[PDB]
């Protein structure tokens, strides 16, 4: 079994928790409910453990959680496609990942969540342009319908494998 330490980041309310809980517990939280989650899965023939750290902008101090962050192997950079501010804020998160990891080359996937919503304000081309500037994949997801959810996390696993031997 190969373990992948994945960290989900992004601005308030973009669906970080909803994506993680959909992936791991197969449940969509329509409540706004402001942890760590694990699931064993087979990815490209490899028995894999997805070890997900679900972050937030308001959390109680925890030295161990800071240790979890620094050892994260790949990051999902989440914005919501109906939240232009969350898209604008991606650049802050990308820079902060590099600080937390003390590294210029960290596996990352850009995720545009809430793709089920018709009130879109971030065009796919905008998000593609941003991802291209960063040299990372862009994937649209809906934690609600599950569209793209496995693809986003499995793409991050594949980005980690491109970066380092697992």
């Amino acid at each position: 079994m190969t373990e992948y330490k994945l960290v989900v980041v992004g601005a308030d309310g973009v669906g970080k928790s909803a994506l993680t809980i959909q992936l791991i517990q197969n449940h969509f939280v329509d409540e706004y409910d402001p942890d760590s989650y694990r699931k064993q899965v087979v990815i490209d023939g490899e028995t894999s453990l997805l070890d997900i750290l679900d972050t937030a902008g308001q959390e109680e101090y925890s030295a161990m959680r800071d240790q979890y962050m620094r050892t994260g192997e790949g990051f999902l950079l989440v914005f919501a496609i109906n939240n232009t501010k969350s898209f604008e804020d991606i650049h802050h998160y990308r820079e902060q990942i590099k600080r937390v990891k003390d590294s210029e080359d960290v596996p990352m996937v850009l995720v545009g969540n809430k793709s089920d919503l018709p009130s879109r304000t971030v065009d796919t081309k905008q998000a593609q342009d941003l991802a291209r500037s960063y040299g990372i994949p862009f994937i649209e997801t809906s934690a609600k319908t599950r569209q793209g959810v496995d693809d986003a996390f499995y793409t991050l696993v594949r980005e980690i494998r491109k970066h380092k031997e697992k």
């Binding site: 980041v9 972050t55 800071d66 902060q96 600080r99 937390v100």
Partner: peptide, 15 residues
């Protein structure tokens, strides 16, 4: 906004 430190993703408001 920004981040309060360089260890995690806790934010601060610039407003």
């Amino acid at each position: 906004g920004x981040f309060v430190n360089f260890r995690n993703f806790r934010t601060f408001r610039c407003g």
